[PDB]
Design a protein around this nucleic acid. Structure first.
Ligand SMILES: [Mn+2]
Ligand SMILES: [Mn+2]
Lengths: 161, 612
RNA sequence: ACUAAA
């Protein structure tokens, strides 16, 4: 049985796709949600996960997003500094997160200074969004009050030198 | 029959100064042999007995290092043979002044010697050179008695000179050995390379038949700096960016230009979103008001690096021209010694007197007169690296006397002296923060309270601005117009002569007097060309050499190598190493460099072929 | 002819 697991994941904000992940970890007495999030945290949300975000986040039609949901970070860029030197003290730091649910890509913008997220964050970590978040011109508006980093590594290397 | 003591100074002007001091105005002056030198005779006390004093000067180095015999004709000696097989000897410098003969004839009957030379490495080297010159002719003296002396001085005031005569020391051999090793290394490594390059490139490419390609541990990195700047200029890709500006109208025709807190955003969509989330609103609120009193520091004492840097940036002068004009002013008697590293006035100095002589010049008569009534401010403590006191005026001058380019340098030096004994500028900084929609804006503004040293140095003045209106929290101001501004990142420009001097001193390349020479040498060899507002532009020949050096061996052009070899040579000076072991080891590491350079010289041929 | 430094 996995009804309790499904209810727990829905309440917690993880939106795993199907029973494929359930059959992935079929160890005896290993049907616990509290440690079933543990493996999914490192597992690729691109590979595993369902489609419940809207179809047209980037179209600009939508205004507000509700519910706590977990999403995966893909690329990090400091839009306040030139590409030649990523670090620059001439402008306050400002990040353009690229976020995904597994199928649909979205763009989020940092307003207030965040200590949990920086340039050196792993290109595959997960962030959980709580409460109602604002969408302006198709872009998410993230603040310190509605972000929770959850960590995790998806074996993506640095690929830079 | 009274005993005699002979004193040697490093330059005739200092000789005359120390003769006028310490003799209570009694001198007998003669000019012997060479016309530059002079002999000052007087009488006094020394070691407890009556004595006669003869004091003279030697103009710089007596002798310089050069190769011996045939190993100086370019066509009959292999350059690679210069490293170990070719012997060296200290022959002479400026042979038209028979300095050795003059010293020998002067020290014919002296019983003691006291060296009044500069307190530095070169001073110690010249000390031992003159010493070796004079001992073979001195009296045999006695047994366990000490005869050679050395005096340590940094200022030419009466009390300091008398104290320096009261307490005497001894020379050290390790510093002289260090500078000898430095001279020998810089001779061999650099003579061999220049000979090879000139003999090779002349015979293969015709456009450089009569030219000379030169290499060295002081001018090659200088060319490398400009080549690196050119590479950065030519390897730059501009980016486009958007900045959001707001105009706020407070009262009638009073408009304030607001500045965005986030100065720049490099994304079209992000800039559009911020514009769309601000343009609709027609109202503003003020959040924070600030009023902080701040100060602008007065300039330190003037050294030769600062003098050259300002002359090459504001006065439109070259380094060599500036130093030649400074030397002319010094020998005429209007400026104290124009080659110093010291930026700290001596504790016992006549600051009040030198400021008094300027009281009768119409340009700054009022400021000087006022400053003496309310007292002088203490000069800022800086760096006192022995040598000579900082560059300060000594006599009053009028534009009709000096005239031309000599006067413009005198004004800046004498304006620096008045500024360094004045008060700091006190300017009030005002900031008002706004909020037009979910964004934060700020405005700045400056008002002056006491000009201080701004009066004598107008170009370092706080700009005049209106006066940000006095507004408290909660005040409301309508907004006039908000719009974006598409701007592009500009590319830098070629290195200026002012910027290069900072880079030379930061990396330890060159001394206070070799900096003007090195800049001029790389200009003479057609490596760089001066253009526009004193900007050094690498010439097509210069680019190939530095680029070619990177492929072959990078640490022949890298700046950090010069500081590394100086560190090893400094170990000899402290006595913790041996002279030959350090010199021999450093020759060996560079000897294999020449062999790797000669057998792989084809690297630069590929780059030279396209450009000739 | 060269390097460097008074
Ligand atoms: Mn000197
Ligand atoms: Mn010096």
């Amino acid at each position: 049985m996995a009804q309790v697991a499904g209810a727990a994941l829905s309440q917690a904000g993880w939106y795993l796709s199907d029973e494929g992940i359930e059959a992935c970890t079929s160890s005896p007495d290993k049907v616990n949600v509290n440690d079933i999030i543990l493996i999914a945290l490192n597992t690729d949300l691109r590979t595993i996960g369902k489609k419940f975000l809207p179809s047209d986040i980037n179209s600009g039609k939508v205004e507000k997003l509700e519910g706590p949901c977990v999403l995966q970070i893909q690329k990090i860029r400091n839009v306040a500094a030139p590409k030649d030197n990523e670090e620059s003290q001439a402008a306050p730091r400002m990040l353009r997160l690229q976020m995904t649910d597994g199928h649909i890509s979205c763009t989020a913008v940092e307003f207030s200074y965040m200590s949990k997220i920086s340039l050196n964050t792993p290109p595959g970590t997960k962030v959980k969004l709580s409460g109602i978040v604002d969408i302006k011109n198709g872009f998410l508006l993230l603040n310190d009050s509605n972000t929770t980093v959850l960590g995790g590594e998806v074996e993506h290397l640095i690929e830079k030198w | 029959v009274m005993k005699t003591v002979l004193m040697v100074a490093e330059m005739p002007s200092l000789a005359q100064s120390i003769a006028k001091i310490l003799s209570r105005g009694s001198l007998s002056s003669h000019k012997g042999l060479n016309g530059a030198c002079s002999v000052h005779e007087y009488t006094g006390t020394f070691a407890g007995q009556p004595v006669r004093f003869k004091m003279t000067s030697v103009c710089g180095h007596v002798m310089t290092l050069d190769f011996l015999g045939k190993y100086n004709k370019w066509d009959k000696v292999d350059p690679a043979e210069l490293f170990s097989q070719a012997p060296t000897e200290k022959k002479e410098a400026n042979p038209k002044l028979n300095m050795v003969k003059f010293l020998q004839v002067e020290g014919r009957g002296c019983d003691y010697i006291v060296l009044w030379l500069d307190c530095d490495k070169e001073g110690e080297n010249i000390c031992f050179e003159v010493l070796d010159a004079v001992l073979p002719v001195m009296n045999k003296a006695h047994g366990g008695e000490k005869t050679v002396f050395r005096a340590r001085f940094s200022s030419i005031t009466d009390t300091d000179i008398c104290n320096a005569m009261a307490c005497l020391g001894e020379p050290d051999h390790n510093e002289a050995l260090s500078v000898d090793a430095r001279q020998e290394l810089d001779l061999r490594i650099g003579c061999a390379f220049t000979r090879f390059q000139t003999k090779y490139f002349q015979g293969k490419y015709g456009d450089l038949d009569s030219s000379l390609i030169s290499f060295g541990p002081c001018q090659t990195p200088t060319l490398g700096f400009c080549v690196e700047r050119h590479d950065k200029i030519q390897s730059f890709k501009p980016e486009t960016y958007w900045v959001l500006q707001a105009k706020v109208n407070t009262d009638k025709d009073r408009s304030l230009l607001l500045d965005w807190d986030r100065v720049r955003v490099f994304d079209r969509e992000i800039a559009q979103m911020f514009l769309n989330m601000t343009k609709l609103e027609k109202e503003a609120q003020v959040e924070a008001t600030s009023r902080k009193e701040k100060a602008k520091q007065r300039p330190l004492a003037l050294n030769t690096v600062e003098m050259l840097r300002v002359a090459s940036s504001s006065l439109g002068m070259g380094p060599q021209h500036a130093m030649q004009t400074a030397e002319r002013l010094y020998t005429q008697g209007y400026i104290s010694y124009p080659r110093t590293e010291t930026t700290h006035y001596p504790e016992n100095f006549d600051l009040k007197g030198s400021l008094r002589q300027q009281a009768n010049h119409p340009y700054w008569a009022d400021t000087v007169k006022r400053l003496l009534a309310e007292g002088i401010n203490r000069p800022r403590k800086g760096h006192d690296a022995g040598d000579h006191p900082p560059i300060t005026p000594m006599k009053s001058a009028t534009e009709a006397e000096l005239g031309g380019d000599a006067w413009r340098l005198y004004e800046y030096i004498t304006r620096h002296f008045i500024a360094t004994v004045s008060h700091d500028c006190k300017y009030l900084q005002s900031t008002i923060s706004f909020r037009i929609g979910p964004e934060l804006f700020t405005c700045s503004g400056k008002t002056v309270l006491s000009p201080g040293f701004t009066e004598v140095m107008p170009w370092q003045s706080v700009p005049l601005e209106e006066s940000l209106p006095t507004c408290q929290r909660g005040d409301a101001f309508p907004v006039g117009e908000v719009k974006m501004l598409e701007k592009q990142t500009n590319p830098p420009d070629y290195l200026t002569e002012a910027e290069l001097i900072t880079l030379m001193e930061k990396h330890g390349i060159g001394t206070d007097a070799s900096i003007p020479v090195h800049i001029n040498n790389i200009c003479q060899r057609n490596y760089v060309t001066v253009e526009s507002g004193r900007r050094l532009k690498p010439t097509n020949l210069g680019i190939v050499l530095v680029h070619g050096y990177y492929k072959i061996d990078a640490e022949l052009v890298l700046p950090t190598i010069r500081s590394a070899v100086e560190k090893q040579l400094n170990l000899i000076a402290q006595g913790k190493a041996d002279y030959r072991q350090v010199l021999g080891h450093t020759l060996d590491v560079f000897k294999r460099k020449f062999h790797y350079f000669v057998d792989s010289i084809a690297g630069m041929d590929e780059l030279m072929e396209v450009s000739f």
